[PDB]
């Protein structure tokens, strides 16, 4: 019923109030996003948008949540979708 995440000092508190949620296959999310947790931090700084992954539907769907401006959310979403499409080819 609770999930914890770390908010970098540089991310405004005004931008955790309207996330963007999209769903995709779980294994695709594992292949693309990975698990290093430092690669993900670097790419978050680059896009200026936070990213989270949570397994849903018995491990067949992931709930990707993206925070930031609408433009930052669009940038992060498009990067993820491009990589995923590469995988699905």
């Amino acid at each position: 019923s609770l999930r914890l995440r770390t908010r970098p000092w540089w991310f405004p508190i005004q931008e955790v109030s309207n996330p963007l949620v999209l769903y995709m296959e779980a294994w695709v999310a594992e292949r693309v996003i990975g698990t290093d947790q430092a690669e993900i931090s670097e790419i978050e700084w680059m896009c200026q948008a936070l990213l989270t992954v949570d397994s849903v539907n018995s491990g067949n769907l992931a709930e990707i949540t993206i925070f930031g401006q609408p433009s930052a959310q669009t940038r992060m979403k498009n990067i993820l979708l491009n990589m995923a499409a590469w995988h699905k080819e």
Partner: protein, 927 residues
Amino acid sequence: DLQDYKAHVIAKFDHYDSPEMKLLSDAFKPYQKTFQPHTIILHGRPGVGKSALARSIVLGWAQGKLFQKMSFVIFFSVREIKWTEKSSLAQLIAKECPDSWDLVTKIMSQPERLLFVIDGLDDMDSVLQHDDMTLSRDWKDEQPIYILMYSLLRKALLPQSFLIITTRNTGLEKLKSMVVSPLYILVEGLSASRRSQLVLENISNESDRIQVFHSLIENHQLFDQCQAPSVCSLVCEALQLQKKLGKRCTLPCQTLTGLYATLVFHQLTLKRPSQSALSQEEQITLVGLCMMAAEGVWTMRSVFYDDDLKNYSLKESEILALFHMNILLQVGHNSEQCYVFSHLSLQDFFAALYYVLEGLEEWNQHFCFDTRLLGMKRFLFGLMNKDILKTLEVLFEYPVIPTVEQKLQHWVSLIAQQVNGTSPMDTLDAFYCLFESQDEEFVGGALKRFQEVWLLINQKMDLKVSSYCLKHCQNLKAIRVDIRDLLSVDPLLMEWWGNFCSVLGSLRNLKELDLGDSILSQRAMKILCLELRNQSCRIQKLTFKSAEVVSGLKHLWKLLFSNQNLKYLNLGNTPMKDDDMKLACEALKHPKCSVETLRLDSCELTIIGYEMISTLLISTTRLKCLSLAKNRVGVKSMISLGNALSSSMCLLQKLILDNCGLTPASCHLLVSALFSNQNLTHLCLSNNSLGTEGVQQLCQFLRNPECALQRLILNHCNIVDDAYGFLAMRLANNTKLTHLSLTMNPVGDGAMKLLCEALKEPTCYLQELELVDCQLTQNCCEDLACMITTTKHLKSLDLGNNALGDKGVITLCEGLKQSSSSLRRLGLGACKLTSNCCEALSLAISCNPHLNSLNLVKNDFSTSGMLKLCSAFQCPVSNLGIIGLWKQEYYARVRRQLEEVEFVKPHVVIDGDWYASDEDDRNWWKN
């Protein structure tokens, strides 16, 4: 000692076995060997379970599973303390322990092994005012408790100890500048999928549940509130109650205000017989609760004490009798009690309900005495629904007509009265606020004055809110819509897009539709074009000059067949392939099509495209204005264009060829072809190399009596030669040409004298001459003054970006005093003027009643010069209607004088964008 304390804690409160808690356990380990945090702040929305998390931390420590390296973990509860009391840190620590003063003295001997957990620190924002306070550094000094917390946070007291704090996203605003290098952790309540599943189970099967479901979960302000389990439960209970009441419930079933009103009013009616009022005492109690909530919201306060209840004549028994739901929870085991609403969203609802009941009586005689206002604002806007106010009328036995409704209407109207366009963000915010009211009359009365709208569509719910609110914008004439990446790539989204398109294709006063920077897929364009085919659509103007709609152009050629109100089409920057060109030409040839203007700037036209355009030009069409700017026109394409324009079947009246790469050969071809043309009246050849031969050929064309040219634009073409002799001789014997523009050509005083001499002839009927950045100097100002005195037809003269100087302007002002002039517009922007010439300008402006417009930007006027010019502007005889200035460049004195100028003459516009106003289609080519 220690084990006894652990036992006491376990008894009071009764870990590390879940992936969530390990983060808290590990948050006190080095980041990269250079940093180790000593302060963690957990923040989140109300009701997500943060106090439970803190208590779990302490319990896990006492049991020996978390932070085992710490020697002591203290716990503070911010609610249950009196911040105005005077105490010392030692007493506060001892309160928790069983009066083990020896242990407390022993605790302070190892500060580096200490840990404080502070809970609910948000409530103290009202006392942590914008001011400094004494910084304590000892644990034995008696200071106010809020001073103790303020000193502990800044690590001036016990600087070596660890801290953990929980607070609300809205309380961080003053902590963040107080703590030193904190680590922030975001606590999130229910997941999105769980909230969706919970809401989807309580909608009525028989009714159209999908629409209400998607209108509930797509509202980000409502949906994000449902992270708290308590708010989700309230929403579910309200949905079930509305289902149970069947047709007895007339309140809205989508807005959160509707659900909260259902919940609160259903309880209030339980004691009463069906449809009967409340007593006077109960009315007093309800109004007092509402006033207390409103005052708490305004003063950044959310915990109330027995003193506050007395001020508003409240009692827990009375409140529990009114509502059986026990709205005011009582918290605090101390002999002094503390009260908090069941949720922080219920304080907003009761705060906004005060603006609706404050006017029914003189309640005050009975009583003894940002981001936090967003919820109250939404509730206040949603309480103006009439089905809701009927219940209040029943309860209070009196008509309810709040005086705030007029204020909200006035605000929404003030949004749309802005002059330099409307702000898309304020427009969307107002549309979100007006969607909560759900009252057709109030909404329609709010949106009366919206004559133009600029929207910015980012989420799905912006489509629904816009469709709802746009349906009542009857005086809407133009609209711009920016949709970046929402419809870019290929369903609820398509359905809401279709509804939005249907709403646009039904307004009767809508003339212009601009698509901004939208990126539309093929299917989105298909839906838009299908919806614009409607016979109720009156849209004349259509603009795609900044959008990417290449993949679905074929749906626009079919729209050209049917919609017969369409007259203007802009396709700038859209690549145009051969097949698309053929289809567009066939659409423009159709007898039903009525497109008069067609812009194809930067469309990458090929030779075959030019052949198709040439064939179109002679066919029977209604096309009158054509633009081919920024397209490379070759020799063969120019031959085809000439063969089209030399015919007598071509009725084109305007032609823009700006920056088409014309050369003297192509220009010769063009002007030779134009000799037989009788219909063309506007011609633009800007940003091309003409030459003396080209100017001579153009003058030869002008001489022909069959010629019809009225406007000729030659910006950035000519060369320093005798080509200005040809034009000068041609002007003196011309009766048709009215506008000539020679901007950014090297004319100079030598050619300026010839042009002035030609203009002085009474046979010349020229009306506007543009000489912006033409290399004139102070030598030609005498000729200009003589010509301004002498002529009878010239009405516009632009001399911007010319170094006339103070002496040049003083010379020119001798011809602006005379009453024999007829000049109405004068440009003097960026002419290197100073305060030296302000006397001459002031005299001319005072003594001239015909001047209507004047430009003065990019010069350097001092305070005294501007004061003289302002005194001149105030003169009764001056008739200036447009003045070119930037009022932000001058001191306060000059600015107040300019305001007085605007006051004395209410029709004067003082705006620095001087080229925005064109009374006579001056920018027919730039568009």
